[PDB]
Amino acid sequence: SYEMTAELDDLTEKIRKAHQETFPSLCQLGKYTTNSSADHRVRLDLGLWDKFSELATKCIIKIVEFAKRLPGFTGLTIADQITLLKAACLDILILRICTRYTPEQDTMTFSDGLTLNRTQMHNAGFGPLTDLVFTFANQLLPLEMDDTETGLLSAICLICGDRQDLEEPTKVDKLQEPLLEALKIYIRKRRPSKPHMFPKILMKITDLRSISAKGAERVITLKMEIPGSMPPLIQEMME
Amino acid sequence: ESYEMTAELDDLTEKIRKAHQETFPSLCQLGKYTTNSSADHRVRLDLGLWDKFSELATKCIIKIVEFAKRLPGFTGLTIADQITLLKAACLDILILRICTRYTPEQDTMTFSDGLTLNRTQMHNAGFGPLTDLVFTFANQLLPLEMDDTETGLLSAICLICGDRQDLEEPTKVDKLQEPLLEALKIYIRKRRPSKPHMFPKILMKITDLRSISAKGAERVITLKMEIPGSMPPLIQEMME
Amino acid sequence: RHKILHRLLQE
Amino acid sequence: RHKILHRLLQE
Ligand SMILES: CC1(C)CC=C(c2ccccc2)c2cc(C(=O)Nc3ccc(C(=O)O)cc3)ccc21
Ligand SMILES: CC1(C)CC=C(c2ccccc2)c2cc(C(=O)Nc3ccc(C(=O)O)cc3)ccc21
């Protein structure tokens, strides 16, 4: 009963759990479709935007609940908790929706079951980023990532000591260290066949930060495209 | 038992420490010199500084090409892939390089000619609204105490990446990348013995670079619209 | 000056 | 398509 092993398994289980109970699996969702601008790309489908942003808002709420379950997170300062949440919002929104990808239909499924094709994702708001995001969803599928890996990957994006304007970067940074170890150990325990899978999986966060940077730019463009304000929570997260 | 034998990776590690050092002079091995141009306050853009900055950026890119060709296997990839890898990772490395030339006490950065600018002058030279962000990143590298060997490997790992869009032989690139990862993982181990967590900590800096280079791509576009002349041709080819 | 995220934090 | 990048890579 080596001590760190026990602590890391504990951390692992707790995060797998936090992920499952705040983000349903594709296989356990009741899929349903819609016919709104499904055949051709338009600048913006206001109807799709509304539903999209509503589901995103509800996902952001889940993301918050997920953070609060991450060991030590509610031990950080209020400002840092807020700061981490805002800087990781897109990262996790991207990751989450890209794990809900179905290759045959070329679709992504939201948590209420809504399933949109690539064109509708574009028309809902993805716009010029659509192909980039889908390409990343494809490179991800073969990884066969589960809730433990996806959850740990999200925790790592979230608990990041390198974010701008942190009050206690050291504390956050050290908080991330056991997350990295748990991921490595879990990957090795799960995939003895393929070594070097830790860097491979771990560095998918590189793609997330890239798309997220573009994402924040995309949101600015949408601000002036949509004839109205975005949902208030999304406003706050994107500030 | 202390460390096992790793002859090939030790050699590879050297062949890369050399490629980096010989295409990028160390801070201590440079004759610094400052300028009085717009040193006091932030301006929209200092053309004097831009001219020199653009010129030095161009040269650094030339060094990066040189550093790439000195990577075992790179000249093996197709000319198309070599270009694809370089174009995607060029900015990442430009960022990594200038950030390893950061002098924390004077809060300055040093180019390969010795030119040394402060936070304000870097902003005025072209960094714009990305200044504080890049400087933050610089300060985050310090505690890592990376040397020429680690900086070279990290740069090589960044360039040699089989995920890039439009790669003809992406699987061939994957093959070249993995020994670089093992090389880094081990070198960090011997160097920092029982002080680990460092391998993933250093590796994740690529994550930070990617974020910055993504915003950087937009900064270049805004600069293209801001500067009187054209954006140096080699620069445009790397961003196209 | 939104109040949502903080209210969500406090639960 | 890339005059410079190509010349530098040829030699
Ligand atoms: C960055 C990108 C690629 C384009 C910008 C998004 C966006 C975010 C906020 C406001 C407007 C657009 C944007 C939003 C999401 C997004 O909302 N993801 C998401 C939304 C909902 C769910 C869910 O219902 O389970 C899962 C994931 C994912 C990807 C993005
Ligand atoms: C992303 C950011 C922060 C802003 C965009 C850069 C840029 C690139 C091309 C044209 C204009 C700006 C840009 C350029 C550099 C850059 O040229 N770095 C660099 C320049 C010179 C040297 C050297 O002399 O050794 C080393 C590194 C570094 C960081 C960037």
Residue numbers in the entry:
A (entry chain A): 170 to 408
B (entry chain B): 169 to 408
C (entry chain G), D (entry chain F): 629 to 639
Original paper wording:
Another key component of the LBD is the C-terminal helix (H12) which is repositioned upon agonist binding to complete a hydrophobic surface with residues from helices H3 and H4 that is specifically recognized by the LxxLL motifs (also called NR boxes) of CoAs.
BMS411 appeared as a potent RARα antagonist with no or little antagonizing effect on RARβ and RARx, respectively. Overall, this structural analysis shows that the mode of binding of BMS411 to RARβ allows accommodation of the phenyl ring of the ligand within the confined environment of the active conformation.
